[PDB]
Structure formats: C-alpha cells, structure tokens
C-alpha cells in the first residue's frame, strides 16, 4: 500500500544540502539567517561514493531550496512523499547500451524508481522528449568558475577555445552541460578536451579548482555564483554563455503535471519563489 511519492534528488548546494542524521536517526535543529527553523527531510541515499561499488542505503538529512519547494508542493497539492538520493549521483544523459538508456535521476524517473524529480534539473530538448518538465522554478545559465588569479575573458578565451595541458577545464559527467557540448559542432574542440577531464560530481570539480588540480569549471551559474560567495578564494569569469531554467521532472503519465506548474506559478506570483532565492541563493560577498 502507498500513494507516497518517491522523490529522487541530488546533492547540489544551495539547492539540496545533504548531511548525516544524528545517532537517533533524526535531523539537527538549524535556524536560518532570519532566525526561522530550517525545514529538513530524511533522504535514503547510498554511502559508498565509488563507481561500480555496492550501494548500501542509509538515511541522511536533506535540506535546501529544493526541499522547501518540495514541502511547498506537498502541502499545497496534499501528497505524502519519501525522499531518496540518486543512486549513481548523476543528473541524467542518454547513452548507448543499439538500444539507449538514461542514467541518473532521468533513469530513475523513467524506470519507476522515483515518481518525481525535485532538484536543480535543467530543462532541455533531450530530456523533454522522454519526460514532462514543470514551468521553471529558476532561470540561470552557464558560466566558468576559476581560482582567484586565473585570467580568462569568458567562454571565448584562447586557453578555452584552443586547449592544451597548461590549462585543464571540465564539467560534470552525464549532466545537461555534458549534453550541451556533446551536441554542438562549434564546441567540438572544447568537448574533446573536456571529456578527458570531466568530474563525477560538481562538489569534486569545485574541490579540484580549490586544489589547483583543475583550472576552470563550466557549470550552472546559480551553483557556481553561489560557491564564489561562500568561498572567496574562487571567482566566476565572464557573463553568461547560454541561459537555462530548472524544472520539476515527472513522467508523461503523471496526473500531477498540471498542479505542479500551477503551484510554481502561484509561488512566483506571490513572491515565495523570490523568498526562497533570498533565503538560499543570494547571500554573502567577497
């Protein structure tokens, strides 16, 4: 028995912060900038971060923009949910197996493992052929994150348009940014360099730009522009090459698709989405 929605998510600060449960299996009482309590959910994701390894599922503490938004969509539409993290830690791309299959959250949604995707999931043509996206809950773009000192014009710096070994840049494997370079001819000389260095996770690449084991990171501006504000040693370069929005993922059969978009609009209109942004996304300076 159930009508309890399987919610797949990913770890992506400031959208979804994932932390351990306490010794009783409960979540730490944290309070916002305002002083209001941080809303927290339990998310049943794995522990072994290694690829091709046994996934041992363990309850964890999930909170962030996308959790507040999920709690909102839940209250509003009146539904119950269970949150779990994407078993392979990926967003979703379609790869050749003749037959093709989706990895990450996209794979999870389409396979039945999840009934909805509440994460910073970029809306694109590829995914939209297979899944239904909500009206966007965020509009951002792509930018380049570098260590303070690294000088780059933007996406058209000679160190990026003509690659080498002195300058190593990459993105997250099996994401929309991967698909973006993988489908564009003008960026063919970029993707062939980037596929040699792509990271399993955003956290890992942002770490590698801190370690100087990476020079530039092409990723989502809502995340990158945030990491720079949190970590003053890192900086974003150039304006925004390509603009994209985030949407709630569902299957094409899902009878919630209408009511999800009606809530996202209700929320934009009544300043609750600007409220979420003011709470999570836009804070700190360097």
């Amino acid at each position: 028995m159930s009508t309890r929605l399987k919610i797949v998510t990913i770890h992506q600060e400031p959208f979804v912060y994932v932390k351990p449960t306490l010794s009783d299996g409960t979540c730490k009482e944290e309070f916002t900038v305002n002083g209001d309590p941080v809303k927290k959910v339990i998310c049943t994701g794995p522990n072994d971060t290694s690829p091709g390894s046994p996934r041992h599922t363990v309850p964890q503490c999930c909170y962030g923009f996308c959790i507040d938004l999920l709690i909102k969509l839940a209250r509003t539409m009146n539904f119950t949910y269970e949150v779990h993290l994407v078993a392979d830690g990926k967003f979703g791309t379609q790869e050749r197996v003749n037959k093709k299959e989706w990895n990450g959250m996209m794979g999870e949604l389409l396979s039945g493992q999840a009934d909805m995707i509440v994460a910073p999931l970029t809306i694109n043509n590829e995914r939209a052929q297979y899944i239904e996206f909500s009206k966007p809950f965020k509009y951002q773009g792509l930018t380049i994150l570098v260590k303070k000192g690294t000088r780059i014009t933007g996406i058209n710096d000679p160190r990026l348009r003509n690659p080498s070994d002195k300058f190593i840049y990459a993105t997250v494997k099996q994401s929309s940014v991967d698909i973006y370079f993988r489908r564009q001819v003008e960026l063919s000389t970029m993707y062939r360099h980037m596929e040699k260095h792509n990271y399993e996770s955003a956290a890992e690449a942002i770490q590698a730009v801190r370690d100087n084991k990476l020079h530039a990171f092409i990723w989502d501006s809502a995340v990158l522009e945030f990491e720079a504000s949190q970590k003053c040693d890192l900086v974003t370069t150039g304006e925004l090459f390509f603009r994209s929005g985030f949407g709630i993922g569902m299957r094409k059969d899902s009878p919630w698709k209408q009511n999800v978009s009606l809530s996202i609009l209700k929320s934009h209109e009544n300043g609750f989405m600007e409220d979420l942004d003011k709470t999570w996304v836009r804070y700190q300076e360097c």
């Binding site: 509009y139 934009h268 009544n270 300043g271 600007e274």
Partner: peptide, 10 residues
Amino acid sequence: GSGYIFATTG
C-alpha cells in the same frame, strides 16, 4: 534595479 523583475514569469 538594473532592470529587475518581480513575480518572474515568461
């Protein structure tokens, strides 16, 4: 603002 949008839509 610098062309700031409130109740953002499209």
